[model samples]
Target: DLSQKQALQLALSAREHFWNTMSGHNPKVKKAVCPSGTFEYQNLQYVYMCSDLGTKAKAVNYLTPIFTKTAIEKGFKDYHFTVSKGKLAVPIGDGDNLLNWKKSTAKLISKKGSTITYEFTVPTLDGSPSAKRKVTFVKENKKWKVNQFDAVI
Candidate 1:
């Protein structure tokens, strides 16, 4: 059982960690020190490969405890983070899409049993409409882990 304040704190902390982890700026965890290499399959089809095995493993290790299994699969594992044929290839524009959510503010929208939801207001760099997003967390193994979250691209 979690109090309202506790739930809010958990949500905020999760949001902070998620942003930092993805951006490779989390000081508390080992950085995902990927290499700057790219390859081309065909004309106008390029794949950016970053195959730093140790760093990739470290990032995934750090994410496991905080994110639900499903979240990890869809957001991280489903990607090319897993080494394949001695290379980890990802989309070229993928890095540009992840927004820095550190400055955002969240409000707890609901809390029921083992699930909690928060609505975040994110300021945009393009001066477009401010982003209003919702992320959900589920309690598992006596800890709240992010169950549903989408990258603010």
Candidate 2:
């Protein structure tokens, strides 16, 4: 069963903190996160189809450097990142002849106890879209931190 109350709280907190953290660095991506988190599990698949590519890519690049280390230190492992086709850049040709196209939507889906999913679309390369991410907390020590299995998904 879904802990709607706890899930909503964590999802909201994650949404807020994520934007606050990225506001100065990347506001556009931050905007995307809000709506993504608001929508939660449904409609996420489509939202990613319409987001801005550049901003999404930038966010991913920014998070890659810190996400795993941060999650690990917080006591998590098996971290796996799966980005959608819309948020990714696809090469249109072979290695010798290639054209790159950016996807309009981007998403980061993680599973801790239950699955937490974030989805968003960017409007422009430099636009400040919201950032949306979902994480479930497990009781550890005396606090609820992102679950240890977050890395697995």
Candidate 3:
């Protein structure tokens, strides 16, 4: 009800804040202090891993560098972003290794308590077409963060 709306608003606000922070537009978002913070778009094979890692550090450590390099090569830039009650909009750029520039919008298809299922579009980094991702999120410390992304290309 009202609480759900408030929760959705909070989630959307947080996402907007995060995107702005990524683009260096907002300096107040306090770069994810959690031990493990990461995000993976639908089509991208690499995951942007940040934070201390803690127990997940080893895996993130191995993946982050590859992700960063791949993202830069593919012309991925932290640009405009949008978020709604079960949706997320992310804009990407067109570069040498990546083309067919487009935006991503993820929709929530299912939910149970703090867990949610999202259906998202995966844009290509090369010339390939877009795909879909069934991702999940959970509320940690009253904040929504990605928990799982099972993408199907």
Candidate 4:
């Protein structure tokens, strides 16, 4: 069981990672420095080929971060499913096109047995005006993860 304080801190860091990927910023998150076992999300260089040749799960596994449960649902609403289309390379979110952090802020909102909500604001990689959002997270299998950002573009 994670304490609220610890959970809040973890949420803060995860929020940063999530937003980085969402912004479509360049140099997506990587574990090359250490083995973190996260999705590549940025290096979709092979996705176009994989979608045409490999398993959809294996192909899209690179984008598991922003493509959450709700995000997938949103996608389904916009585009139907197809597994044979691995060759059809596509991006699931907008923040995918482009980072440094100079300023930001966070505030705890509330928590439940498995969920925590946090309010925060951070400038884009270029130090643009900050975007404020209330991010919700959940602990599943001991990892703090974003529940949904389906509305994010």
**Cα lDDT tens digits for candidate 1, 75-144:** 6644434343454444344244233455667777888888877777877666777778787778767878
Sliding window of 10 residues with minimal summed lDDT for model 1: 44-53
Query: Which of the two candidates, 1 or 3, achieves a greater TM-score against the reference?
Result: 1
Off by over 4 Å in 2: 25-69, 72-134, 147-153
Better of 3 and 4 by lDDT: 4
Best by lDDT: 1
Residue-by-residue lDDT tens digits, candidate 3, 97-120: 132213445566778876665665
Worst 10 residues of 3 by lDDT: 46-55
lDDT of 1 at 20: 56
Error of 4 at 87 (Å): 3.3
Q: What is the TM-score of each candidate against the true structure?
A: 0.60, 0.26, 0.34, 0.47
The local distance difference test score of each candidate is: 0.57, 0.34, 0.38, 0.44
C-alpha lDDT of candidate 4 relative to the true structure: 0.44
How well does candidate 1 score on lDDT at residue 122?
71
**Distance (Å) between predicted and true CA of 7, model 2?**
1.9
Candidate 1: regions farther than 4 A off: 1-33, 40-57, 77-82, 94-103, 125-127, 149-153
lDDT score of model 3? 0.38
